[PDB]
Swiss-Prot record, chains A, C:
Homohexamer. The keyword Acetylation applies. It is an enzyme of class 1 (oxidoreductase). One of its GO terms (biological process) is UDP-glucuronate biosynthetic process. This is UDP-glucose 6-dehydrogenase. Pathway: Nucleotide-sugar biosynthesis; UDP-alpha-D-glucuronate biosynthesis; UDP-alpha-D-glucuronate from UDP-alpha-D-glucose: step 1/1. It catalyses: UDP-alpha-D-glucose + 2 NAD(+) + H2O = UDP-alpha-D-glucuronate + 2 NADH + 3 H(+). Residues 129-135 are annotated as: Allosteric switch region. The gene is UGDH. Its EC number is 1.1.1.22. Pfam families: UDPG_MGDP_dh, UDPG_MGDP_dh_C, UDPG_MGDP_dh_N. Changing C276 to A/S: Loss of enzyme activity.
Amino acid sequence: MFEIKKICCIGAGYVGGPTCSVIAHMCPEIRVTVVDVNESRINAWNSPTLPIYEPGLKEVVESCRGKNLFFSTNIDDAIKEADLVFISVNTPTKTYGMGKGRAADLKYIEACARRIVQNSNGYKIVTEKSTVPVRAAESIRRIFDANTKPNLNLQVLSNPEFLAEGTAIKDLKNPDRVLIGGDETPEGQRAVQALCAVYEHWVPREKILTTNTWSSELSKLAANAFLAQRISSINSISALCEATGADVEEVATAIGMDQRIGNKFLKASVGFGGSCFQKDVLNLVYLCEALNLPEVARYWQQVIDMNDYQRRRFASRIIDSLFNTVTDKKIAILGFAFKKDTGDTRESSSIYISKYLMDEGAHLHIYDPKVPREQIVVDLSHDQVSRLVTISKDPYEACDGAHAVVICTEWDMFKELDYERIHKKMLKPAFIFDGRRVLDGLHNELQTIGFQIETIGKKV
Amino acid sequence: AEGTAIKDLKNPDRVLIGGDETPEGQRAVQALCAVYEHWVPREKILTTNTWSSELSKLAANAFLAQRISSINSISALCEATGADVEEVATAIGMDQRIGNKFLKASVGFGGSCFQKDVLNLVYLCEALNLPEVARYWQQVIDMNDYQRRRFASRIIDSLFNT
Amino acid sequence: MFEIKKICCIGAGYVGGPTCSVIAHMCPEIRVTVVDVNESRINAWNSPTLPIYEPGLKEVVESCRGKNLFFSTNIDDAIKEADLVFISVNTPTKTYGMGKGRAADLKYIEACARRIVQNSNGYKIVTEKSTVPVRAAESIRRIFDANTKPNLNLQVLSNPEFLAEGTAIKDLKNPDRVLIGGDETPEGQRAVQALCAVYEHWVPREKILTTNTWSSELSKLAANAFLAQRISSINSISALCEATGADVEEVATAIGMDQRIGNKFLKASVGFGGSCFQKDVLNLVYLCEALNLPEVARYWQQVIDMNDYQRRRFASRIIDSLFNTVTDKKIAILGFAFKKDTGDTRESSSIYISKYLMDEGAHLHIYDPKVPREQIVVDLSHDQVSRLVTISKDPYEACDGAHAVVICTEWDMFKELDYERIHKKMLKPAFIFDGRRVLDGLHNELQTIGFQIETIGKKV
Ligand SMILES: O=c1ccn([C@@H]2O[C@H](COP(=O)(O)OP(=O)(O)O[C@H]3O[C@H](CO)[C@@H](O)[C@H](O)[C@H]3O)[C@@H](O)[C@H]2O)c(=O)[nH]1
Ligand SMILES: O=c1ccn([C@@H]2O[C@H](COP(=O)(O)OP(=O)(O)O[C@H]3O[C@H](CO)[C@@H](O)[C@H](O)[C@H]3O)[C@@H](O)[C@H]2O)c(=O)[nH]1
Ligand SMILES: O=c1ccn([C@@H]2O[C@H](COP(=O)(O)OP(=O)(O)O[C@H]3O[C@H](CO)[C@@H](O)[C@H](O)[C@H]3O)[C@@H](O)[C@H]2O)c(=O)[nH]1
């Protein structure tokens, strides 16, 4: 039996970082090196404050860094030395050309493949580990099939990651299932077994699914789409609730007790964010079009268009409540991260909402406990940002003289705020726009304070 | 044709002279006719009126361009079904009523003629209230656009779309 | 070295009859039996007057019928006793279901296949022989693959006939090329060689093209469409001639002198007919739609649309020239066959011109030299045929008392008609609509006679 003794992971991001830190923690007798071109990101991994916020991540890293888990920019030597090589890079969507704005760019995957071949001899297992794998494993394989050395035997595997940011550690420590794709050769099932034995250190065997490379990638795509679909479906219902005086939260509860539907992912919101769902459905639509499946394409397209509609519907409500003129009005934006417990803003609903108010010439004051100030200004760019955007150091500086408070992220702190204090120094009418349903049950207090609280999935 | 101009001029298939159907006229056509008679045999010189000459040219270039586009369309169909357009072009070409010339499938036709010529024929037909005829010849340009674009996509595709 | 001694042909049509008759004539020592379900048709092939009209066929057929060539209707024994079996039946366009009015119905090709399997043992070569082969060869093989007997070895070849009705004998005696398709196996190439040897009795080696089954059918589909395209291209130009004042016969000559284009199939007409051209193009469009090639389907569609327009334009001119009514007006239709020297009416533009005029209330008088009376009545209906349609025994009958004469078929004899006699008895002004250009050079004669002679590709 082949035993993985040394692991190398190209990509030290939200996926590779936490994944390898867990692998190393659960597997003391196997050396894990995480590598990356980003010198800044690598140094942070080796420091007291990590480059990404993720609850419980620190304690995991600090228990095996320097012992068992390593972070290096020396990508060559880590590739040369390893039995398993994870490729966990990002695939940004093409900004030009055919597929512009929709299809994923595989250049970094391709580049990594080329670099593996350069720095590899003998047997190595190369596993593609991403959140939205788009023809990835086949791209790697195509590089490996075309650039061969003597005694170079590289096996390509697919191993899509299911963790969700904010809950990475729990998800990795206790996953619903691990999925591994690998060719139906004996060569083949041997490489699959090797990685399968790595997971077996902490994942029960019954939760490890092994299939072929494509079926693996297509499963990931669909699972992602199904998840995005639940949020878009409930958000569609939220529109319908506001229009008819019912409550989306009660509706959602009645929906979710049907054990066939389930009660997860039915929290209506301003719209789904994150570097996964949109990228995922857009690539699924693209694939379908490429395969002459206009019907399938058309069906999944609805998940994005519903998300897009949810965002504009919510922005429009804010503008509306402000007599359709927000020029030179102070408005607090509470929460920027796409999700609570993360510093990640990729495709965050907060970016879109902010831009819609920007176009209306609002003076925005953005607060987020974890998103770095610099990131916020990059996200809201390409002179207009200098005019309209201020980054508040605490929420109260944000609502000091604001016309409206816009809650976009379900940080638990936003429930704890002193709404007595905030209302006293706001210009009236004072609006709170709750895009997360965080302030549910506080409605009566807020109304008797003097707010006019508007939330999604419920209108008076 | 450019690239074989000297051959084509020394030994043309036909020469085409359009003049007014007056006697003034036919005297003008004969003089020019007599310039070409220096190397061109008399039964290779066609004499007609002005417009009948200009329409025949337009048609003539349109008919050739259509040849390329038709075989190009077949090329697409071959790629979808595992045949060879060169083998098909042979079988088609051997029919003496079709002719074997100008059936070489390609990335698409170029030249200062064909595209300008077809689009003009279209425009004329639209002006004369013949939308049926316009739509017909417009398919020669559209197929050519398609062939080029299909070729461009295959390159991009094969390089992982990046 | 397998040699063919006994040939059975299923289909005693315009393809099957003439083809096998020539094969019999050119190859004395090989017995050729032609079979059909249609008793009437077979009795006729055995009698003094044949079921179809084809210049020269009478001599070919009577020189070897009963020596070497037979007609049977006993399909079962002919199949059983044969080395090579042609399938030359018709494939009507579907009248219902998906592909209605466009796609070819393979119900006869399949039923044939099925009967061969029932009556066959040992080795036999089965060749599909048609004008428009649409997935023919595959269908057969699909039937044979699934219905195997012990020691049955059936080979499927493709062999599209290029004969043109009217000149069938000449074409079969001296074809431009012969096209045989068979599997690129050795089983295989041997059946192709054995059919190749049939033709090598009168067709030289380098005129016989041998490719694979599908290539062969695609080659025929394409060739038919290219020829159809020439007719439509010149017909389009004819429309342009009429609005601008030039001559399509003259413009066609200028075109034809270009050896790259060639001077054949540049005769403008009322609209191409026959069981081939339209069926071929519609099936090419349908195939393309099924392979997701909209652009290619859109391209060849124009060949049909243009032909339709040619027919419709010519018709409008007739009603236009007769003061926009033909109600209770006598009109002569000269020529009903799709082309000259044949009895065949399938898809004839005469059928269309006649119907269009009847819908406007014209009392028509039809004459054709070789089309049977009964055929004309079928074609023209689906009772209104009782009121409006008379069938004339000679041209001069059709013309006596008539307001107009429409020529739809380029019969040679039409040039030779006595026009002084025809004018004398017509109602004035008398019109001649030449939809075939057969009366060029006769213009002056006919105008001076007093006619108003309107022809396609030239306007007054
Ligand atoms: O009922 C819900 C559920 C989620 N969200 C939002 O959905 C987005 C995505 O959230 P979440 O799925 O928790 O975070 P991700 O990091 O995107 O994780 C998902 O995306 C990963 C990438 O595909 C998958 O691997 C995980 O399995 C899947 O949970 C966020 O903007 C959430 O605010 C809400 O709108 N309502
Ligand atoms: O089988 C072929 C033949 C040509 N081409 C292409 O078609 C374009 C035009 O070809 P060609 O006709 O040889 O060049 P031209 O100089 O445009 O000449 C044509 O056009 C002239 C008007 O420009 C006419 O006068 C000529 O008679 C006619 O041959 C070129 O890009 C060729 O490569 C093909 O793709 N396939
Ligand atoms: O210059 C022309 C030539 C033909 N036609 C018309 O088009 C029709 C078809 O004529 P033709 O092609 O000779 O008769 P087919 O029996 O259909 O034969 C053609 O189609 C056959 C299959 O049907 C092929 O096998 C032959 O190769 C091909 O010549 C007739 O109605 C003609 O009047 C024109 O209008 N103008």
